[PDB]
Design a protein around this ligand. Structure first.
Ligand code: CA
Ligand code: CA
Ligand code: CA
Ligand code: CA
Ligand code: CA
Ligand code: CA
Lengths: 225, 197, 225, 196, 196, 197
């Protein structure tokens, strides 16, 4: 790209991911802060729509965060980002869509339409979004206008401090009545994939999560449920 | 001073390209790095890594779907990552599209490097390894010993490279690339090749 | 490419080759120096591996050099470079490999593996290496990190001055015993091509050689064998 | 909190035959010799600072035979079986069964000028597995190596291999002896009776 | 892009008789010894930096016989046939079959003071044909020399000639061994299996 | 330092004088330069030219018609000049009347030289020769080897002196002059004379 109004579509986009070392620091007063990134999910696209969802709480966000945050009783999200990176050609048919819900009791969207309304909605070609790399690697950012990544509006959730919950116990509780979840988890990410060319799933991309959390009030890892 | 220092870069592993995730792993000891080194390093009883770097180099069309992943494990007794997720936690995680990394080439022919930010290559942190000098082991004998108990391996091999090759447009393999290893090693205390186990 | 870690694969690479006039100069003391470039070989790729080799001596290096250097008895390589240029799409399957051997008696490699060990090994996608153009045209060079080109380590060959040999006579001599070649030619380039999609060869690229030679001790062109 | 001592003692008695006979000694305090075996046991760990095996004759200038010595470090490696193989090891050394009387100087450190003939080799303390090794007993070691040899590398730094051939008989003949001259650092005391 | 190593290994075993017996060894990596033969093969060319052949006894002070050694460089020259001729070569050296136990010091480089008796000779690396020679195999060499000897000078720098006489029998008697102590520079790697 | 340096000037070749062009050639190795050197240089395995110079000296009347020519060839495999024309192309070409060159004498007796522009003498450029140290060879053995293939000679002899003696007033020979060689050589690695081939 040289002038203005002109754009060039490549045969394929390339993003070399390199995750740096976790950042931990015991800030006086009790809070221990941790900022880090992890591969959150594997993406595949079909010709018919498919809606997936993930709870945004420590145990489910990332595999490392799970084991680490378990040593503390409560926590508070400070920043949560779900960045999408493509691993296919510009010749691949398909689009992705993401957004948030906050009342686990609400129904999970069933149309790209309903989804376009949610908080922090994002949509893009299955083969793009390589621009959002700067978020995961933690480098200086350029033109992120073409990136597929969304964030949680931490500033307006039920409460500030939630309890560290384990998938197991969470499920056991939700089993009684879903509404018991509202005081356990802040929100959930919704993900839709359609506009593909095959009836059998195809390699689309992958989603990485980059978060910053505050952990408080220590407890033996084994007692935490 | 008894030490024989050699620096070389040979082919370490070929990469096939599927859609379902197959996760493999190679030990980071001379016998396995590559065939050329396997042959020379055997003439010496022990060795010490000074610098190990695995680089992925493509050999496919831009129309090839897929991504490759690399990382390290250090307690040979830990479980090999079962999901690429867990793999993204390991020290030195890196991942790119199977057709990229063209720039990494400068690590293999040892020429002047420019911008290596696009290269799919990761390095071993020799500074924080168990020992300095390790014994030269054959896969055969290693296996026999790990059969008794894996922990017996901890003082035989420094690390392990975990590789994953998920994503693909076909349910069968397609030659995608090769992982070359560029190392600098110190070999000590000679021995007849035939006796080294 | 704008930020860092991001790369874009084109539908095809383009390199416009323009060879400049030969550079000759009679430097006092007897040596006559010549620097020039020539198209050295045509490249094609299959699905099974194919190993090719070329002796690196005046008569075989280039078609012009052959006739020119013939007017001098001996010579000495100062710089020899084999640059690869692609003439196909990013959609073409295939890779190339190059390296050197020095004892014509040694066996010619049979696997990409064995070849990865040779001196000055190089490997790359059949559709790339357009970056090495700056070498052939003789322009200012940019980022040659993506180029497919290798050089002879002239600084460590059998001897400095070799005799101008003709393919014919060379062959006649090698026919007796290959080892008689070691004092006639310094080394040979090996070239491998595999990872292709057809059983029938496909247009891959072409290799250009750019050399600088010292020619000494004149002789009538007809007496030179 | 360290205790360093330097000393030399008899390590093993040698005899020569008509056929190659390969033997080996561990380079750990317990097997070097009687004296050290007993003292080193009062400490938990140790570190070699200088190890040297010197061979010294006891036969006539007329006795036929040769001796060979070298070091190995991966206890799992196969022990040599030919003079040729043994010559490839580090610190190789060979000589006539009646030669090497010059190595004596090393045993009572003095003014050693002419040590050209000395049949004596030294251990490279600098490039051993680790610095501090645990004190082990012949008994306990053997038991662990019975399970798998590789369990040994964290227990012993190396072993000295020896070969004797070119003899004049087929039944042993007094040749000489191998003495060891060491300097070791011992730490973390313990009742000698609890050391295994 | 070079790789340098220094080492010593067994080169050949010696036996003495009642009549002169002349033998010879090429001074190329493949024939020096087993170890080097196997390592040097992973590189295309090499360059000698220091070559030394040391003889070491294994018999009694009572064994009769003498040994001789020298160098030759034009592989086509006729190999000596008398102690006299062999004494004219460069680096000549002679001594009693049971002598030379002092040369040992050279094999495990140390404090060598008294090397007067040492039966050991050195190669003049500085004045060889060329600097970088190609790695050749016993097999391939022989084939080329079968055509004409002169095809050899671009393949090997020189050869060590040896003679043994003044013996007490007419049937071989264990005398000693000849070890080689080298320092070599190897370059331009190659799969060991492609080297001829 | 092992080297034995000798500098001498002896007779190298006699020149007959005809009218039809006879072109000859001598190798530039000790065994052929001259008989005296042939004898001494044989006691040493190898050697190295430091300075070789062939000079023509007359022995005829001014009434003698004719011209002599000299030059060098370096790839023993090239064809020996067939016409004096081609010969005038070779490195170090020189040519004068068979009765001149009286002044070249100063190269043979090694006295102080004055104006040597009239001397029929040419030199070998040792600086750009294949090797530094060559093997001492006998014409006999050389011939045997060149019989298999000339290229086997390239690592045995540095050059070759090509001489032509055309022009003459008679169809039969007439003693005209001699070509003397003035050399400085380094002989190394002794050997018994009888074994040197
Ligand atoms: Ca809890
Ligand atoms: Ca071993
Ligand atoms: Ca020629
Ligand atoms: Ca103990
Ligand atoms: Ca070879
Ligand atoms: Ca000769």
């Amino acid at each position: 790209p040289t002038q203005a109004g002109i754009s060039m579509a490549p045969s394929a986009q390339g993003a070399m991911v390199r995750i740096r070392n976790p950042a931990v620091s015991s800030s006086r007063g009790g809070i221990t802060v941790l900022t880090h990134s992890e591969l959150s999910a594997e993406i595949g696209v079909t010709d018919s729509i498919v809606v997936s969802s993930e709870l945004v709480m420590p145990y489910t966000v990332g595999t490392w965060l799970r084991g680490v945050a378990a040593n503390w009783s409560k926590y508070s999200w400070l920043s949560v980002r779900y960045t999408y990176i493509p691993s296919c050609p510009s010749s691949t048919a398909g689009s992705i869509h993401m957004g948030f819900q906050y009342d686990m009791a609400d129904t999970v969207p069933v149309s790209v339409n309903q989804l376009s309304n949610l908080r922090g909605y994002v949509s893009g070609q299955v083969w793009s979004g390589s621009a959002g790399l700067c978020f995961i690697n933690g480098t200086r950012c350029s033109d992120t206008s073409t990136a597929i990544s969304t964030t949680l509006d931490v500033s307006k959730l039920g409460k500030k401090w939630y309890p560290y919950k384990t998938s197991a116990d969470y499920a056991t509780a939700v089993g009684v009545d879903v509404n018991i979840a509202t005081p356990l988890v802040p929100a959930r990410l919704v993900i839709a994939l359609l506009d593909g060319s095959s009836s059998t799933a195809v390699a689309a991309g992958r989603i990485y999560c980059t978060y910053t959390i505050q952990m408080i009030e220590p407890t033996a890892s084994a007692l935490n449920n």
